[PDB]
Structure formats: structure tokens, C-alpha cells
Amino acid sequence: MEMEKEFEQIDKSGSWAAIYQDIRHEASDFPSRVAKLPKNKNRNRYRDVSPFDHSRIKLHQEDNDYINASLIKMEEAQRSYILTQGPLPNTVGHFWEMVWEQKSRGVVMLNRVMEKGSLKCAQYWPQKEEKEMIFEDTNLKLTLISEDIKSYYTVRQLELENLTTQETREILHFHYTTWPDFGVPESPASFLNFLFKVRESGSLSPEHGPVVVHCSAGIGRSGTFCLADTCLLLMDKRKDPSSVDIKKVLLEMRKFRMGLIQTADQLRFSYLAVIEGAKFIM
Numbered sequence: 262m263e264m265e266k267e268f269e270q271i272d273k274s275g276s277w278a279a280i281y282q283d284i285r286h287e288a289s290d291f292p293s294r295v296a297k298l299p300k301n302k303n304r305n306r307y308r309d310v311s312p313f314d315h316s317r318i319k320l321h322q323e324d325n326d327y328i329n330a331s332l333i334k335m336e337e338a339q340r341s342y343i344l345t346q347g348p349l350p351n352t353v354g355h356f357w358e359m360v361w362e363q364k365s366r367g368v369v370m371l372n373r374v375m376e377k378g379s380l381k382c383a384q385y386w387p388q389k390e391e392k393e394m395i396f397e398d399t400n401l402k403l404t405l406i407s408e409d410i411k412s413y414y415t416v417r418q419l420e421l422e423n424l425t426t427q428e429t430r431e432i433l434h435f436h437y438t439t440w441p442d443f444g445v446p447e448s449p450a451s452f453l454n455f456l457f458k459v460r461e462s463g464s465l466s467p468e469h470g471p472v473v474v475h476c477s478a479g480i481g482r483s484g485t486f487c488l489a490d491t492c493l494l495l496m497d498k499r500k501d502p503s504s505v506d507i508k509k510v511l512l513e514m515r516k517f518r519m520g521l522i523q524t525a526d527q528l529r530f531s532y533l534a535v536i537e538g539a540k541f542i543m
């Protein structure tokens with residue numbers, strides 16, 4: 262069923278809440294035993310958001326390999342994403358270790374450091390060229406190289422140096438800065454513009470490791486980003502784009518990380534972004 266028609270049918274009936282709860286009811290449940298170990302309690306921002314053991318990213322150290330991050334592997338679309346929480350004060354060095362080990366080209370950030378008067382994630386990147394950051398626990402150095410500030414997003418060029426080997430890489434930081442404190446954007450136009458800027462960078466392409474995507478918990482806004490990207494990709498690859506079922510794509514993605522898409526408004530916004538995205542590159 263064409264999703265544009267499904268959309269109008271749900272909207273006229275006002276059944277967004279009932280669709281969303283059907284997804285929650287059918288979603289996968291897998292063990293998260295590593296996330297719940299007592300040694301990892303300060304590595305988790307939220308007690309009810311954990312990575313599944315089967316899909317978690319492992320850090321390459323013998324001490325403690327744990328980070329709140331999951332590999333989402335979409336077999337038919339041929340895309341991979343790492344979804345993670347906003348870094349904590351004691352996990353900033355783990356975060357950049359993961360970026361290094363997984364060979365990511367891009368970091369996608371969908372939240373502000375402060376929202377609703379509370380801290381949603383640590384200030385994990387340098388704000389001035391001449392004041393670099395050193396993460397002593399993971400032996401990495403991070404330098405701001407360039408800054409391009411637009412109305413809806415900022416793009417930063419960063420230099421990450423493995424102080425052990427003195428190799429350096431260029432990491433692109435894509436920061437979406439205008440998601441509202443409550444609800445979802447009214448129009449998906451600026452979110453779709455942002456997605457096509459990430460695509461054009463090469464950050465989503467198979468010659469790099471997976472893109473690292475985060476918001477505060479790494480399930481809501483982060484979920485919307487990878488659901489829209491994957492749905493638009495399959496609509497271009499398939500002989501019938503009307504065969505793309507966004508609810509089935511979301512349940513496939515929820516096999517790899519719990520809770521992706523946090524509200525019925527985020528589910529409706531996802532339909533909108535895909536509906537408009539397709540209708541712009543049509």
C-alpha cells in the first residue's frame with residue numbers, strides 16, 4: 262500500500278498512537294547482560310536504554326570493552342550505522358576510541374549540549390582551533406580545523422590523532438542544531454537537506470566504516486535519521502518503490518537496537534520525511 266495513502270488514512274482516523282503501540286508490541290527482545298553488569302553502571306546515561314549483546318560495539322581493550330553503542334546492519338539497503346548515546350563525562354575517551362577503531366568518517370549529532378535547562382551530553386569536541394583536547398585514558402588528540410555555521414546545522418572538520426602511532430584522520434562532525442525542545446519539526450525540509458549533506462560527504466558510503474549517530478539516548482531522533490535514509494535508499498533500488506513498508510523497516514532495525522522511534526509524533530515525522538524526500542528526488 263502506497264505509504265502516502267496509508268498516511269492520510271492514519272491521519273484522518275487519528276490512529277498514530279495505535280500504530281505506534283502495535284510496533285512496540287511486535288518489537289524484538291534480546292538479552293543486554295553486558296550493559297547491566299555493575300562495573301558498567303556509570304557507562305549508561307539511561308537505565309532503560311541498553312545495547313543488545315548480539316549487536317553491541319566492543320572497544321579494543323582487555324580492561325573493559327563496554328560502550329552504549331549498537332551496529333545496525335541493513336542487508337538489502339547495503340548500509341551500516343552505529344547508534345550510540347550522547348557521551349558522558351567518563352565515556353568521552355571511549356567514544357573517540359570507537360570512532361578510531363571502527364574507521365568512521367562522520368559523526369552525526371541531533372541534539373544540543375543543553376536542552377530544557379539540563380545537560381543532554383558532554384562537550385566532547387574542541388570549540389577553538391588553538392585549544393585542542395587530549396583523552397589520556399584512550400591516548401587520542403582532537404583538534405578543531407574548520408567550522409561552517411548555517412541556519413539549521415553546523416559542519417566541523419576535526420583532526421583525530423592516535424598518539425600511540427601518530428596516525429591522523431579527518432573526521433566530519435554534522436551537528437543538526439534546530440530540533441525543537443518539545444515535539445518534532447513542523448516541516449521535514451531542513452532535516453532532509455541535512456541528510457543529503459551527510460550523504461554528499463561520503464560519510465554513509467562503504468569505503469568508510471559506519472557513520473556514528475547520536476542524540477541524548479541514541480534511539481529517538483537517531484532512529485528517525487537511519488529509518489529515513491534506509492527507506493529512501495530501498496525506494497530507488499527496488500522495481501516498485503510502493504513495496505517499501507516503513508513499519509517493516511523499523512521492526513527490522515529494532516532487531517539491532519531497542520526503542521528506535523520514541524513517540525507516535527516521531528513515527529508520523531518519519532513518514533513525512535520519507536514521503537517528501539521521495540517526492541523531491543522523484
Ligand SMILES: NS(=O)(=O)c1ccc(Cl)s1
Pocket residue numbers: 406418419420421429430431432
Ligand atoms: N589544516 S588543513 O590543511 O585544512 C587540514 C585538513 C584536514 C586535516 Cl586533518 S588538517
